[PDB]
């Protein structure tokens, strides 16, 4: 029920011989599982937690300079040297300065000059790296019980990814994950600013053009390449001065366009990424699936509701006797000829007589009728579904295509049952995605559309090669238009 | 002499008094009192609403966030008319004096 | 759509495309009129006074 | 152009082309900034709120 | 039952408390302490000085 109302709702149907289905969970999204004779469950990734962060390096973004020094030499005497020149807290640069009799030197020509200033950093941003084994994944397991702590929270660790949830009345659900393949934190770093944090690629973080310290440095004098944060001026080639650049925190913010914001205020809270997990439902049961009918009447307390996924949610109240008892629910036609819909909330049950119960159903396109109870006093509703089968199919195919685009090879594991076709598709798309990543790494989206246009034109103007090229081009165009950055 | 300030661009800004109001789908956009004044930056986006959000229908509902804009550090762009220019030139002959 | 004493049943989209000042229905302040320029005219007869 | 303690002699037109919040120099309130969106950002991590 | 107000369109308006001020050419745009409030309507046009 917790997944009711979220536009990122997904459905998986059927089970294999071992009652195992591969599923994939993303932050902010959740999936709904059901089978022929299994309870309907909701799976949601809510929290990603990293316990042990390690500081990789500290990037300074505001600096101040004091103790400015200057030493000059007459021309043809080399360049001057100062004892702060070795002192690498002091950034130094050598330029050339006009010298002459008016400058107190007996010769005329290009005279040496050097200036040094103490480099002191006011505040900086931290880049934290976490080993993959220090990740914590939180999963809520709420069944479609119809109740108005409803679900069960379980934790996934890379070292112990084997777990099960004890559902009250449903038995036990076994859910084993594999976080080693979800996100490779071995190449990721948790950049942390004054109060905001981003999850960025480690390699892109290392080569940032800022002064930096080793992650273990504490005193603050081991800054590398301070020249990227300070500048030297020779307006008239007569005297050089060094001034500090401005705060780079705004520039850094502009530099994190494609970065994903995370939380590091009260712990390493991550609300990003996916999780491909293996679901086993051998030992699931239905609450009171043996009770008889509710021969009494019913009344709707909250009327028909339409979600973004074509399903209906109904809360109804029972006033007859025999509780607990089964709820007669079925999607019939007007003359009562053929079954038209199916129940998302399989086996609606009245736990307590005065307790309202929420029911879910998926009516077909067109006129749909909800049957509640039995004569006398049977309820019949008159909701109409807006859409068409072709529209549903095409929306499904865009959803699948975008999911493939955004999950890579793991998208085949969203509803894989271990079939050979699924494995072949996964391998082919895996090698294709490896080629694509090795090809279009670190490139803007508009450039992706440009490339797609180029290969589409080439394929159009050049037959197996032509069709392969146009397919690659249209795929690249779809990837470019669908990618956020 | 006498430059005229033309335009001041901000650098340091702080946001306070953030407010969001809970707009259901198909009932129009939300509205706040603070958007009456232009010190508050506001933007309309589209968010999910439902029974869990205490609304009678499921769908994509409106929302607006408004927070007062307060600038701390700004630059100044000044324009001086050409008539106010001042040029100083030094004149020294070859007198030979040290 | 309701007038002072008359009413009409109109399509939602055409109503949303009306070029008149508007508040959202949930608004109660009664002052934030959007696109007010559709009901005002700024006259600048000879480039001396607006 | 004037900074806190530095200054630059730069083109006027490029200066007006700076995509930052601004007021005309004649203002005295110093609070009616223009295109403030260029310096703020609204985020919708899961389309639940901004 | 329970109709919901989707949108309120203004249809009668009046303009009062009109104010204006000019600025000499090439010093930007004229300013009031007043445009900060959105209940007023403002437009920038171009005049001779």
């Amino acid at each position, epitope marked *: 029920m*917790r997944c009711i109302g979220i536009s990122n709702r997904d459905f998986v149907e059927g089970v294999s011989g071992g009652s195992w289905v591969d599923i994939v969970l993303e932050h902010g999204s959740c999936v709904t599982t059901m089978a022929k004779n299994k309870p309907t469950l909701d799976f*949601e990734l*809510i*929290k990603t937690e990293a316990k042990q962060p390690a500081t990789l390096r500290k990037y300074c973004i505001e600096a101040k300079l004091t103790n400015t020094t200057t030493d000059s030499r007459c021309p043809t005497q080399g360049e001057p040297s100062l004892n702060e020149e070795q002192d690498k807290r002091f950034v130094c640069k050598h330029s050339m300065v006009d010298r002459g009799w008016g400058n107190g030197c007996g010769l005329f020509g290009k005279g040496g000059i050097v200036t040094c200033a103490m480099f002191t950093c006011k505040k900086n941003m931290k880049g934290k790296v976490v080993q993959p084994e220090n990740l914590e994944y939180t999963i*809520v397991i709420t069944p479609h019980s119809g109740e*108005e702590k409803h679900g069960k929270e379980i934790k996934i660790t890379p070292q112990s990814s084997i777990t099960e949830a004890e559902l009250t009345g449903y038995g036990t659900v076994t859910m084993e994950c594999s976080p080693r393949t979800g996100l490779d934190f071995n190449e990721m770093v948790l950049l942390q600013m004054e109060n905001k944090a981003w999850l960025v690629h480690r390699q892109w973080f290392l080569d940032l053009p800022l002064p930096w310290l080793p992650g273990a440095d504490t005193q603050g004098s081991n800054w590398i390449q301070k020249e990227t944060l300070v500048t030297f001026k020779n307006p008239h080639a007569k005297k050089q001065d060094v001034v500090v650049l401005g705060s780079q925190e705004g520039a850094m913010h502009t530099a994190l366009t494609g970065a994903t914001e995370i939380q590091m*205020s*009260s712990g390493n*809270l991550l*609300f990003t990424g996916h999780l491909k997990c293996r679901l086993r439902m051998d030992k699931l049961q239905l609450k009171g699936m043996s009770y008889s009918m509710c021969t009494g009447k019913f009344k709707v*307390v*909250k009327e028909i509701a339409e979600t973004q996924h074509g399903t209906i949610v109904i*809360r109804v109240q029972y006033e007859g006797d025999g509780s607990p008892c089964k709820i007669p629910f079925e999607i019939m036609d007007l003359e009562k000829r053929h079954v038209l819909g199916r129940l998302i909330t399989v086996n609606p049950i009245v736990t307590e007589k*005065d307790s*309202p119960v929420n029911i879910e159903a998926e009516p077909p396109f067109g006129d749909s009728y909800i049957i509640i109870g039995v004569e006398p006093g049977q309820l019949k509703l008159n909701w109409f579904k807006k859409g068409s089968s072709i529209g549903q199919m095409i929306e499904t195919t865009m959803r699948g295509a975008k999911r493939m685009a955004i999950l890579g090879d793991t998208a085949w594991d969203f509803g894989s049952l271990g079939g050979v076709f699924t494995s072949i598709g996964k391998a082919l798309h895996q090698v294709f995605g490896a080629i694509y990543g090795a090809a279009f790494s670190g490139v803007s989206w508009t450039m992706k559309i440009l490339i797609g246009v180029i290969i589409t034109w080439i394929g159009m103007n050049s037959t197996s090669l032509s069709v392969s090229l146009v397919l690659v081009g249209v795929v690249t165009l779809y990837l470019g238009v669908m990618v956020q950055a | 002499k006498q430059p005229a300030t033309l335009r001041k661009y901000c650098i340091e800004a702080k946001l306070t008094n953030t*407010t*969001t*109001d*809970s*707009r*259901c789908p198909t*009932q129009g956009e*939300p509205s*706040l009192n603070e958007e009456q004044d232009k010190r508050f930056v506001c933007k309309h986006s589209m968010v999910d609403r439902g*029974w*869990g*959000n*205490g*609304c*009678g229908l499921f769908g994509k509902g409106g929302i607006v966030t408004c927070a007062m804009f307060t600038c701390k550090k700004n630059m100044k762009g000044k324009v001086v008319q050409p008539e106010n220019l001042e040029y100083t030139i030094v004149i020294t002959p070859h007198s030979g004096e040290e | 759509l309701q007038m002072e004493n008359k009413a009409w049943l109109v399509h939602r989209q055409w109503f949303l495309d009306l070029p008149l000042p508007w508040l959202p*229905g*949930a608004d*109660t302040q009664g002052s934030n009129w959007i696109q007010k320029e559709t009901l005002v005219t700024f006259k600048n007869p000879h480039a001396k006074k607006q | 152009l004037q900074m806190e303690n530095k200054a630059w002699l730069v083109h006027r037109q490029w200066f007006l082309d700076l995509p930052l919040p601004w007021l005309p120099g004649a203002d005295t309130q110093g609070s009616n900034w223009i295109q403030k969106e260029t310096l703020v950002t609204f985020k919708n991590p899961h389309a*639940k*709120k901004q | *039952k*329970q109709p*919901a*107000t989707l949108r309120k369109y203004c249809i009668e308006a009046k303009l009062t408390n009109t104010t204006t001020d000019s600025r000499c050419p090439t010093q930007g745009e004229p300013s009031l302490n007043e445009e900060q409030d959105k209940r007023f309507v403002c437009k920038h046009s171009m005049v001779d000085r």
Partner: antibody
Amino acid sequence: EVQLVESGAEVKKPGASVKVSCKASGYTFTSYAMHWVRQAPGQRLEWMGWINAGNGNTKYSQKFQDRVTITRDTSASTAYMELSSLRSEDTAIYYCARDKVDDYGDYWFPTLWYFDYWGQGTLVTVS
Amino acid sequence: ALTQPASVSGSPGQSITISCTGTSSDVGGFNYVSWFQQHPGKAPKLMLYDVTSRPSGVSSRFSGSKSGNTASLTISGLQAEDEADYYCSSHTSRGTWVFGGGTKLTVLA
């Protein structure tokens, strides 16, 4: 069992400062928001504001913006509501209430069963 | 604020309806309609939240329904212990909470 414990009755001169303690036990304090509601004797209830124990952020009513500040203590599983510059009309009964935050540790949309439990109340008299 | 009758009285064992009226931002737009019972000298206790549904441990005598901008509370079979202060609360659109003026329930002897 969720038990809400409040301090005893207090009397203070007008213009003073009073901090009340509401201690909640029997549950995970960090995963629930905390509310403060006042009520003049024989009058209607008034809502001041709430504090989210997950992050410690603050939100108060429009009337009580510049005078009411509420803080939380994770270690003691209690929230402290401090009101300064008391007035003769501030004499009322003060109740502390609890409700559930979402699974993301935020209190943007309150749950349907908000104000699920209530405290016994603190009586403050202003001279 | 929220407008509701100051006092409502009814014979025991009867059915009575009390209504709480607000505005479109809090009552007529949201389902955050809840009712609380205030015993004299005792802490308030919720008798009804999400008027379409009822809480746990509360008798089914109390029933709530919303008609437009007005939310109504109906009690079937009035009894002696029902004499208490009842408050209607709504979570407004602006993110704050508004309460009714308080209602005193009287049962005839």
